[PDB]
Amino acid sequence: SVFSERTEESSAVQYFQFYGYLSQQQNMMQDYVRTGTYQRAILQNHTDFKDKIVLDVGCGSGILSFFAAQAGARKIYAVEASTMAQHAEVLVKSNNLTDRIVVIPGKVEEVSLPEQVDIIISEPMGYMLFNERMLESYLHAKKYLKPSGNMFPTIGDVHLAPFTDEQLYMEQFTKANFWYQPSFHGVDLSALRGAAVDEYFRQPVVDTFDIRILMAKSVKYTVNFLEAKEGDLHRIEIPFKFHMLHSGLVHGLAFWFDVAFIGSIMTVWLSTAPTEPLTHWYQVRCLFQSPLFAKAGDTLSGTCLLIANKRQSYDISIVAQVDQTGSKSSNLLDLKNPFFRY
């Protein structure tokens, strides 16, 4: 299938094992910003669901399908590849919704649906929006979408901004400098210091921070899920030009994302911005191995390049320069090995 062709079996096994746990579903369901915003998006846009046919891509517990049923959907096909499909079916029966929600076990790339649908719903967002590569499954599912059908969420905006955080930088450097020691119990480790620094700086940092660390207004990169093809997410090139508002050391780029549910009644946003209540996505920071000095009024330009890999994640390339001095930094990060600092 499209899924197995792009995914190493060992990554897939671990991925679906992880989502098969009730405790993991519980953790996500308890993220009230997420669950509450989805419910509001669906219920306030009840006309997009009333008497409609729905596809729920990766239904987990089934929660979003229940919201589609509360909004009056005629039929909801709830697709789920983990063993959580069995628990979803239990809930559909105990909530007396067997006439409206149909659980379909399997990968959305592999199953068969009996009819086309009016609207697709899902929660396919990972860290930095793209981690887990579930957006590709979401877009793949448009093979089932009627012409002029809708997608909830409809669009995703990735935000990036330069930050200064000397304490974060020093923490990662302090850990790598373990490998400087010329006599760790009598052993010279220092030939590995470079490899250690590289490994630590390849880890995106997942946690939150005060917005005062941001040195310029964010640049926005938008993916329109109604128009995008799955292949568009294999290589994602994000150019940026920041107008520096504060002078100082730039230690890296911070990332967050917003999604919008563009319904017929209203547009509802779910934001993971550092100005908004915290979610289990936090925000993500990519450190530079050497920080760049910039003055207020300078321009920091470059490209963030995300290349999808078979471990359901991305290899991240960030190249940035301060245009006024030609100071350049090039960084490679492995989104599959984040440092969970929170």
Ligand X SMILES: NCCCN(CCCNc1ccccn1)C[C@H]1O[C@@H](n2cnc3c(N)ncnc32)[C@H](O)[C@@H]1O
Return the DSSP state at 184.
B
79 contacts which partner out of ligand X, its own copies, none, CB within 5 to 8 A by kind? ligand X
Structure tokens that stand for 48 in this block: 């997009």
CA distance 248 to 245: 10
CA distance 218 to 210: 15
Beta strand pairing status for 117-122 and 53-57? parallel
Task: Report how many residues bind ligand X under the rule CB under 6 A.
Answer: 27
From the list 56, 89, 118, 132, the catalytic residue is 132
13 contacts which partner out of its own copies, ligand X, none, CB within 5 to 8 A by kind? its own copies
The verdict on 29 binding its own copies (CB under 8 A) reads yes
Instruction: Map tokens 């990060």 to a residue.
Output: 333
Taking CB under 8 A as the criterion, which residues in 86-105 touch its own copies? 87, 90-91, 93-95
100 is known to lie in a ligand binding site:
no
**To the nearest whole angstrom, how small is the minimum distance from the Cβ of residue 172 to ligand X?**
21
CA distance 274 to 102: 38
Structure tokens that stand for 193 in this block: 């210091």
80 is known to lie in a ligand binding site:
yes
CA distance 72 to 58: 20
Structure tokens that stand for 171 in this block: 């923490």
Binding region for its own copies (CB under 8 A) out of 5-13, 117-125, 218-226, 301-309: 5-13
Structure tokens that stand for 229 in this block: 């093809």
Using omega within 30 degrees of 0 as the cis cutoff, is the peptide bond preceding 277 cis?
A: no
5 is known to lie in a ligand binding site:
no
CA distance 131 to 119: 24
Q: Give the residues lining the site for its own copies (CB under 8 A).
A: 8-10, 13-14, 21-23, 26, 29-30, 35-36, 39, 61, 63, 66-67, 70, 87, 90-91, 93-95, 175, 178-179, 184-192, 195-196, 199-200, 337
State the residues that interact with ligand X by CB under 6 A.
3, 16, 19, 28-29, 34-35, 38, 58-61, 63-64, 79-82, 84, 107-109, 123, 125-126, 134, 137
Give binding residues as ranges: 25, 34, 58, 80, 109, 137
Q: Residues within the annotated binding site for S-adenosyl-L-methionine?
A: 25, 34, 58, 80, 109, 137
Which residues are marked as active site? 31, 123, 132, 280
